From a paper:
Type III secretion systems (T3SS) allow the transport of protein substrates directly across the double membrane of Gram-negative bacteria. Proteomic analyses have identified the major components of the sorting platform for the Salmonella typhimurium SPI-1 injectisome: the AAA+ ATPase InvC, its regulator OrgB and the proteins SpaO and OrgA4. Here we show that a novel, heterotypic interaction between SPOA domains serves as a scaffold for sorting platform assembly in both injectisome and flagellar T3SS. Our structures suggest a partial model for the subtype-specific assembly of the T3SS sorting platforms: the heterotypic interaction between SPOA domains within a given T3SS subtype functions as an adaptor for ATPase and its regulator through interaction with the APAR peptide.
To elucidate the mechanism of FliH-specific assembly with FliM–FliN, we co-crystalized the FliM(SPOA)::FliN fusion with a FliH(1–18)::lysozyme fusion. As with its injectisome counterparts, the FliM–FliN SPOA1,2 did not undergo large conformational changes upon APAR binding (1.11 Å r.m.s.d.); however, the binding mode for the FliH APAR is radically different. In contrast to the OrgB pseudo-lariat, the FliH APAR adopts a near-linear conformation along the ‘top' of FliM–FliN. As observed in the SpaO–OrgB assembly, the FliH APAR makes extensive contact with both SPOA1 and SPOA2, supporting the observation that the FliH APAR interacts more strongly with the FliM–FliN heterodimer than the FliN homodimer. The FliH–FliM–FliN assembly is characterized by the burial of several highly conserved hydrophobic FliH side chains. Two tryptophan side chains form an aromatic clamp, which binds hydrophobic pockets on opposite faces of the FliN thumb. Similarly, the bulky side chain of FliH Leu15 fills a hydrophobic pocket on the thumb of FliM. The binding interfaces for these three residues are formed by both FliM and FliN and are highly conserved across species. This structure presents a conserved model for FliH–FliM–FliN interaction, which is distinct from that of SpaO–OrgB. It should also be noted that while previous investigations of the flagellar T3SS have focused on the interaction between FliH and FliN specifically, our structures and biochemical data show that the FliH APAR more strongly interacts with the FliM–FliN complex than with FliN alone, suggesting that the FliM–FliN complex is the physiologically relevant binding partner for FliH.
Author numbering:
A (entry chain A): 1 to 182
B (entry chain B): 17 to 99, 144 to 227
The structure:
């Protein structure tokens, strides 16, 4: 031990969350776009701003209301660009925070270099933790740096089938470890 | 060429009597900060998010504090239209530093919102604790349940704390 300290309470040494990698913010603006009014997203759920999922399930009243709590004002289902911006900021951090606390996603995230971690956040940003943690074999493949194998498996998913142009970009990022798809 | 960007994790308002009694193992309670201020020569220059990159502590610059509008591509105007037996028990602030990085001027002036700056401190390795801008101790951020603190791991003698304090 480096020190000889009298320990009364169960204090645990704390380390902060990893910072989001570059260029996740530009990446996500590209894939999520921007809307200042509530819409149904490519997976059927109410969304706002830059991919900010409002309610997991029906409907607008709850959406507008969870929007109302998210923004802290009456909104009427409409927000500001800078409101969208601050939601986005929060969302990116909350995604990273969630991954790092997810017993299944965390070893994969840790494995990956920065560019590929962006891709994983992008997925989680799109489908949430529970959804992304379901790609069991693709994840283990990612953990084991079998890039082509994970890549070809990922193209065999509902996700890819529902949003091919986004999924292709993300899978190209997983496969290559580069930003050429952006 | 060349200054020090200094990230302050936390400021801890203590009384001098507490400071003279501090020892390894003492835990100072703090609020976990979300944003923090980085300074240069004691002058706050930006606020930022913080975390780690490659195991190093790092900053994501959020806002420049009172930035200057670049108007160097135009001529300067002549005017601007905008023209001791018993020692007193004083409160004293302990500064806990997340870390520092040496940067050139050119490098410092070329960061804005979203700039990620890596500090020279490793995650896990103890933090500098200062008094009046003087190193007096090291500590580690520590937590139980909901409560955060800074646990002293190493510290100079009371006489020396006093010495750095006065100067």
């Amino acid at each position: 031990g480096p020190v000889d300290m009298s320990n009364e309470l169960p204090w645990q040494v704390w380390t902060p969350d990893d910072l989001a990698p570059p260029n996740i913010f530009e990446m996500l603006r590209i894939d999520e776009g921007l809307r200042l009014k509530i819409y149904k997203d490519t997976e059927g759920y109410y969304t706002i701003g830059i991919g900010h999922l409002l309610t997991k399930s029906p409907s607008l009243n709850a959406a507008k209301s969870e929007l109302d709590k998210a923004i802290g004002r009456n909104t009427n289902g409409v927000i500001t660009k800078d409101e969208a911006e601050k939601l986005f900021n929060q969302d990116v951090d909350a995604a990273v925070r969630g991954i790092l606390r997810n017993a299944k996603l965390k070893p994969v995230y840790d494995s990956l270099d920065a560019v590929r971690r962006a891709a994983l956040i992008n997925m989680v940003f799109q489908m949430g933790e529970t959804g992304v943690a379901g790609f069991t074999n693709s994840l283990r493949m990612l953990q084991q740096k079998r890039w082509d194998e994970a890549a070809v498996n990922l193209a065999k998913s509902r996700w890819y089938n529902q949003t091919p142009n986004r999924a292709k970009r993300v899978i190209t990022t997983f496969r290559t470890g580069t930003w050429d798809a952006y | 060429s060349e200054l020090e960007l200094v990230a302050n994790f936390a400021d801890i308002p203590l009384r001098l009597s507490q400071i003279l009694k501090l020892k390894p193992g003492d835990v100072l309670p703090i609020e976990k900060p979300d944003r923090i201020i980085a300074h240069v020569d004691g002058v706050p220059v930006l606020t930022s998010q913080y975390g780690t990159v490659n195991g190093q502590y790092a900053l994501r610059v959020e806002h420049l504090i009172n930035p200057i509008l670049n108007s160097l591509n135009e001529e300067q105007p002549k005017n601007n239209p905008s023209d001791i037996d018993l020692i007193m028990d004083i409160p004293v602030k302990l500064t806990v530093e997340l870390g520092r990085t040496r940067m050139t001027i050119k490098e410092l002036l070329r960061l804005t919102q979203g700039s990620v700056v890596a500090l020279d401190g490793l995650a896990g390795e103890p933090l500098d604790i200062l008094i009046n801008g003087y190193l007096i101790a090291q500590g580690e951020v520590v937590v139980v349940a909901d409560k955060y603190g800074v646990r002293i791991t190493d510290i100079i003698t009371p006489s020396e704390r006093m010495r750095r304090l006065s100067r």
